[PDB]
């Protein structure tokens, strides 16, 4: 009935024309069964399982095309499918890492409260199995270290999949943190020693850092001058708020009175 | 013996004298909280009698 739907899934798509045609094909299903709340007769959710597969690859095509709003839309759809009020559904082979795509992207956005509340659905299951989720939680463990280097050892080997597009964003968002977290405050760091973390050989990223930081560029070495930095005293600056706090404090004494 | 205040050095052979005499301002507060203990303890008897 209806279809042809999954025929374009094995072959995937050469361009975004067939993908847009897949969304236009799914628009008819979205006009008939819509998205919810059809309980049934749960056999009416069978074509919704067949729609979950092409929505999973709809997020693989949303990250393949790099589009951010498309990715979050399709992920809202999948997440709501595993959040459907009927928990009895055929097991999806992608159910595991499809939470890790949005989790690693969410980590690229730096969302602390949503990370922990994401895993709140199955706390004991994410630890015992699903290696695809065990990589981001080991990444969080390594983010309180932080890493930096341990993550660079784990970034060589990832299954992954599709995390290539996300680990590039993770790359840049770590590399600027090398520059931010090295100083303040270190007295000095030798040249090749920082070259060991920036990798490459003689990158222009360290020249752009010689601009961005500024900060200092010294011969065969580097310096946090001057000095460590800005030298807060703060002398008579805090005496203003020290008088000010006592103003309203005396006001509280007068409110008693 | 506390009759003399300072500090020595075995290596450099240096004795240094330092003194900060007054202890009065803390005695002020310390001897207060120590008695306020029995203050609150004495309040528990009335607070226990009014309730039960």
């Amino acid at each position: 009935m209806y279809e042809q739907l999954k025929g374009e899934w094995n072959r995937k798509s050469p361009n975004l024309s067939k993908c847009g045609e897949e969304l236009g094909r799914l628009k008819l299903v979205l006009l008939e069964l819509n998205f919810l709340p059809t309980t049934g007769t749960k056999l009416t959710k069978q074509q919704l399982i067949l729609a979950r597969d092409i929505l999973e690859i709809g997020a693989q095509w949303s990250i393949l095309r790099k589009d951010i709003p498309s990715f979050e839309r399709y992920m809202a759809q999948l997440k709501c499918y595993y959040f459907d009020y009927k928990e009895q559904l055929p097991e999806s082979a992608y159910m595991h890492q499809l939470l890790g795509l949005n989790l690693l992207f969410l980590l690229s956005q730096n969302r602390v409260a949503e990370f922990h509340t994401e895993l709140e659905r199955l706390p004991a299951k994410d630890i015992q199995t699903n290696v695809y989720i065990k990589h981001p939680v080991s990444l969080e463990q390594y983010l309180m270290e932080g890493s930096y280097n341990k993550v660079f050892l784990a970034k060589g080997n990832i299954p992954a999949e599709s995390y290539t597009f996300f680990i590039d964003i993770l790359l840049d968002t770590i590399r600027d943190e090398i520059a931010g977290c090295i100083e303040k405050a270190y007295e000095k760091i030798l040249f090749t020693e920082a070259t060991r973390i920036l990798f490459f050989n003689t990158p222009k990223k360290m020249t752009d850092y010689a601009k961005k930081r500024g900060w200092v560029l010294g011969p065969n070495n580097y310096y946090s001058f001057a000095s460590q930095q800005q030298k807060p005293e703060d002398t008579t600056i805090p005496s203003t708020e020290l008088a000010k706090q006592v103003i309203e404090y005396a006001r509280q004494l007068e409110m008693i009175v | 013996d506390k009759k003399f205040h300072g500090i020595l050095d075995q290596g450099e052979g240096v004795l240094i004298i330092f003194d900060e005499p007054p202890v009065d301002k803390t005695y002020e507060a310390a001897l207060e909280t120590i008695q306020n203990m029995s203050k609150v303890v004495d309040s528990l008897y009335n607070k226990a009698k009014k309730l039960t």
């Binding site: 919810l36 839309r73 809202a76 959040f83 | -």
Partner: protein, 153 residues
């Protein structure tokens, strides 16, 4: 995650969307709080045929958030679909609030006494005498005089 489905260009999905909202809005009243900003697009668009009904779900979510005058704002430009429903609880709350607004505005209007009058929308004043016809039809005579005391007119 039904909020992200509002990113679709075709309005034919928007009618189905609002059809999901009003059905699950009792539990999902809080789920529309962060979507208000996306509701502004549907209400502010004149080529959107369902803006009349978009203001209904907006007024409901502002009922959940405790917004009164803000629900009146969408109540006005919500069209005929808004005042056509006299059922259940939501109809009495909005006319109590709208007549309170209307009667303080009318005590102000009688204090002009004329000239530089404030603009009076035909909808907010039309539901006045329109729902007053209920007191004439039910023949209840105590309320019939009360409304005329309220508007001062």
């Amino acid at each position: 995650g039904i909020i992200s489905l509002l990113d679709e260009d075709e309005p034919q999905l928007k009618e189905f969307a609002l059809h999901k909202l009003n059905a699950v809005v009792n539990d999902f009243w809080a789920e529309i709080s962060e979507s208000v900003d996306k509701i502004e697009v549907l209400y502010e668009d004149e080529g959107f045929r369902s803006r009349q009904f978009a203001a209904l779900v907006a007024s409901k979510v502002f009922y959940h958030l405790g917004a009164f005058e803000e629900s009146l704002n969408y109540a006005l430009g919500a069209g005929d679909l808004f005042n056509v429903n006299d059922n259940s609880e939501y109809v009495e709350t909005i006319i109590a609030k709208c007549i309170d607004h209307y009667t303080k505005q009318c005590v102000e209007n009688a204090d002009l006494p004329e000239g530089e009058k404030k603009p009076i929308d035909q909808r907010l004043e039309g539901i006045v005498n329109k729902m007053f016809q209920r007191c004439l039809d039910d023949h209840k005579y105590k309320q019939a005089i009360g409304i005329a005391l309220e508007t001062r007119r």
